[PDB]
Ligand binder design. Structure first.
Ligand SMILES: Nc1ncnc2c1ncn2[C@@H]1O[C@H](COP(=O)(O)OP(=O)(O)OP(=O)(O)O)[C@@H](O)[C@H]1O
Ligand SMILES: Nc1ncnc2c1ncn2[C@@H]1O[C@H](COP(=O)(O)OP(=O)(O)OP(=O)(O)O)[C@@H](O)[C@H]1O
Lengths: 549, 549
């Protein structure tokens, strides 16, 4: 699940392809910039030592100009040195930000393209809490993928650069890579579960905040505290195992990489010190052996920084799993114009179970339909099948496209934004007038909001600082009623518009509905709205339905 | 405001005390362990450089035996000298985890103690997205606070333990910390706003996930994509200025801290080399001024690591606001026993508006009350005032208690967990039998769930893998009806029981309700449930009521 091998590299290439898509794109200039201002640094660090070993020597004898004037160059190279360092830093962080932007854009365009933000979750249980796998996991993956750059690549143009100056068979990375890896697999395995627990904790908090009024009424403070501490203590308890494992890792990661590296370096550098027969004043080692031990230290630092690789396997496994949002692919629907038909389609829940297995009926744009029954017999699930929310697993089905068809769900929804956008949820604001017909929001909508909605002076046409769906009350489902009269659909399908009002304004909405060519298809548990309806289509929990007039 | 000054230190102390309660706690020993394993680690380098200079001095000659016997000591010390480093590493992040645990526990016990998880937000708008400020902000703050240790403390004692061997007037921190800070102020406010934008982005994603079905029915994929990409681009556009400021800061921060420090060290160390009269073979500089330039490097590194201080100003200035949940302190309430009184109490919304100002009614244990009226006239807001959800605002009222009372909110709520816990939401499971009367879940609760709930075989008494409030349907509000009969309160204040079956189950619930002595206080828009009710108390949108029979 986090093993570093061929499959991991393939699963990393398949996600790197979508980022830096082309040649010399907007962000491919950072793979070159941090490939030129980074090598310039590793030529500027040997120069740091070279001036370092030639400055103190200057101030040894009674020489002032050999240090005063000599030191000046260092002060002259300080601006360039710092500029190179910070240019590398900026290139790195800008590259990670651009990587994140591209990955997020791809994931979103692939994640809201259809009824897939709904299927992930309520329909399919394969990924838990997707609101964190593409908001916090993407950021961490972008941060880590670049940090495997500049580390395992920064001490890479330091072995070759030192090799430029230079029998050295000290390729002990062969035995310190096969070892010191495959011993760090638990880090990759359990970074995934740490992320999972963090996501669950955050989701519990968010759910508590969301329905913070129902919980308040029930006085469930103690129960909610218990059920949150249950998942918090399930997190830190695991972090203790994770944190204590990194200690057991550093012990072997600091006696085979950071310290034993210098031991082998000393062992190899001093092989020809028992040709250079005499090398009278044999301080040449300071310019040919010191560099060798520095190279050995960098070679050890390579594998030492290889730690970030396995900690990235978990992130890659998590995100590459989120790229099973290709369920966009994994009976038939006929695109009719005026008649909604149901040819022996057994409606069913997402799992395997049939509520009503006949559903042999149809409607036309001349007879408002009202359907009733007990609570829990494929009533609100009929629309989910008619709409592309649930599968069909049946015969034929016809509907008037999707533009000339409106749905009001069983539960209210007020989008976040301005009041105007509440009347127009789907289209938006620019489409409201520019792309489509120009509706005078100043005046044309007050008639569309003639449902007794006095909440127009209550905030003005553009009120968002004090707006939400926790403020309207029970009239936020008749605010959805003032959405048909703007969308003017050929067919309107209403799921429990009741609970708005008994008689004061319930009749007004329906009277206006068939004062326009809006054929109605409603569910309601009432006897005071049958006057403006024609057909019956009554169904019960016995698996059979009665279609009458 | 994230300026590093007296107020910041005061605010850091006031929240440091809550994670160091007593002397030698479960984590107060980590301030000792990482204080002796850290000073025992600065004995590694000093021992490393001394030995490091020792070996090759033994290989300048051809003494194989000397080098061998004087290298084995390094092999022997490798285990201890790596164990010390890794023990510092473990004691470091274990301390941050403990800090996080204590801070989270305090914040939660202070945040779920009353109806404050509700007041924060719906009632008060002072903190936005409280679900991220105690889930992600706390973790980052704990990580940062310790990282100001081992950095500004790791090099702190590398200055006193180098002074152990030593005219050192190079105290230029006075001019390099007064400068180079107050020139980094933007980082604090800018990390604060970055955290704000990240929280808003995550909240938008969570809100999209929560009511995904409603969004799917409206076909609002395009609108939701637009409103998400609007706040994502509002974030990365700011991270661009953030990482374009760090480089603009790193430039100045790497020519006054990391390289000019070396220049000043070379300048000061050279003063005597111009009273060491002759010191023939002046190699003593390798141990009498090399340490001096190392000390200057560490002194520069102190101010360089001072960067984490200002980046920690933002987190502290953020969390200190979340510790304004002291609104728990921010008319009259009388604990009567059997009368829900209302003496000239003007019910009002959280803001400064009044809906009805008389409210001079009362009820008794033998008079069920059903109230109605238009939609949007303090109907469901009467309970929010009767219950301690909204301010009393004046007048007087008396209620029996909070234990022998019940509220069914207008919107349904099924807590996450098992099916059994759905019936017992507030009390939980342990209290279901131990702290209170023992109810036989296998048999006793079937009669308590005699409301037509056929979901006895549907998952079993303990089903959580396939449970949620997005699965029940219209029966998740009458599952709250099969939750009043278990609490058996004095009065049952239920709200919008409608959308349950009109006749099949509506009559059964109310007939059973008055069989047991639970006086019903209900709001509904119906005529089929008025038979089992006594008093009108009709409500209107003109601030008046009747209270007839
Ligand atoms: N996600 C789901 N998976 C499986 N079964 C579900 C799911 N959601 C609901 N159900 C069950 O499937 C059937 C759906 O009933 P349904 O929601 O359609 O009608 P209705 O909505 O019951 O009428 P009402 O709105 O009044 O409750 C019921 O058996 C319901 O309990
Ligand atoms: N948080 C809030 N702040 C200010 N006003 C609110 C808030 N919530 C609701 N309101 C408004 O306050 C009044 C309370 O209405 P209320 O919720 O009481 O309607 P209702 O009585 O619940 O009727 P119903 O349940 O059918 O709507 C209404 O004016 C409502 O629009």
């Amino acid at each position: 699940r986090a093993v570093v091998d061929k499959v991991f590299f393939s699963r990393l290439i398949q996600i790197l392809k979508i980022m830096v898509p082309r040649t010399f794109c907007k962000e491919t200039g950072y793979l070159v910039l941090i490939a030129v201002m980074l090598v310039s640094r590793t030529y500027c660090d040997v120069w740091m030592i070279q001036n370092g070993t030639l400055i103190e020597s200057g101030i040894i004898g009674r020489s002032r100009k050999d240090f005063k004037r000599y030191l000046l160059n260092f002060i002259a190279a300080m601006p360039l040195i710092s500029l190179v360092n910070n240019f590398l830093k900026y290139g790195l962080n800008e590259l990670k930000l651009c990587f994140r932007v591209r990955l997020t854009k791809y994931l979103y365009e692939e994640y809201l393209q259809a009824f897939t933000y709904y299927k992930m979750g309520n329909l399919d249980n394969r990924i838990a809490n997707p609101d964190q796998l593409l908001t916090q996991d993407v950021e961490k993956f972008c941060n880590s993928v670049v940090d495997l750059y500049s580390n395992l690549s920064k001490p890479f143009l330091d072995i070759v650069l030192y090799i430029f100056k230079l029998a050295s068979m000290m390729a002990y990375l062969v035995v310190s890579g096969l070892f010191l890896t495959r011993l760090r697999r638990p880090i990759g395995k359990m970074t995934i579960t740490e992320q999972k627990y963090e996501g669950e904790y955050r989701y519990v908090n968010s759910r508590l905040i969301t329905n913070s009024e129902e919980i308040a009424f029930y006085n469930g403070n103690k129960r909610e505290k218990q059920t949150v501490h249950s998942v918090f203590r399930k997190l830190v308890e695991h972090l203790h195992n994770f944190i204590l494992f990194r200690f057991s890792m550093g012990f072997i990661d600091s006696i085979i990489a950071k310290y034993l590296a210098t031991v082998v370096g000393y062992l190899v550098v001093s092989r020809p010190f028992l040709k250079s027969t005499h090398s009278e004043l044999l301080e040449d080692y300071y310019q040919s052996g010191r560099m060798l031990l520095r190279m050995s230290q960098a070679l050890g630092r390579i594998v030492l920084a290889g730690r970030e690789m396995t900690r990235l396997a978990g992130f890659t496994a998590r995100i590459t799993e989120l790229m099973q949002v290709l369920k966009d692919l994994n009976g038939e629907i006929i695109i009719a114009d005026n008649i909604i038909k149901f040819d022996h389609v057994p409606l069913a829940t997402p799992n395997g179970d049939v509520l009503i297995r006949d559903l042999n009926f149809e409607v036309r744009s001349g007879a408002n339909v009202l359907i009733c029954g007990p609570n829990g017999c494929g009533k609100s699930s009929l629309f989910r099948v008619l709409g592309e929310l649930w599968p069909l697993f049946g015969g034929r089905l016809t509907k008037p496209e999707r533009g000339k068809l409106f749905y009001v769900p069983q539960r209210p929804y007020m989008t976040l934004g301005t009041l105007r956008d509440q009347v127009i949820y789907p289209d938006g604001r620019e489409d409201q007038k520019r792309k489509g017909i120009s509706d005078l929001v100043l005046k044309e909508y007050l008639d569309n909001v003639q449902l007794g909605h006095i909440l127009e002076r209550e905030g003005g046409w553009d009120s968002v600082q004090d707006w939400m769906d926790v403020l309207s009350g029970g009239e936020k489902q008749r605010m959805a009623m003032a959405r048909l009269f703007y969308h003017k659909p050929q067919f309107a399908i209403l799921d429990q518009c009741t609970s708005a009002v008994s008689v004061d304004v319930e009749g007004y909405i329906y009277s206006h509905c068939r004062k326009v060519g809006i054929t109605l298809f409603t569910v309601s548990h009432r006897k005071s709205l049958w006057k403006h309806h024609e057909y019956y289509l009554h169904m019960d929990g016995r698996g059979n339905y009665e279609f009458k007039q």
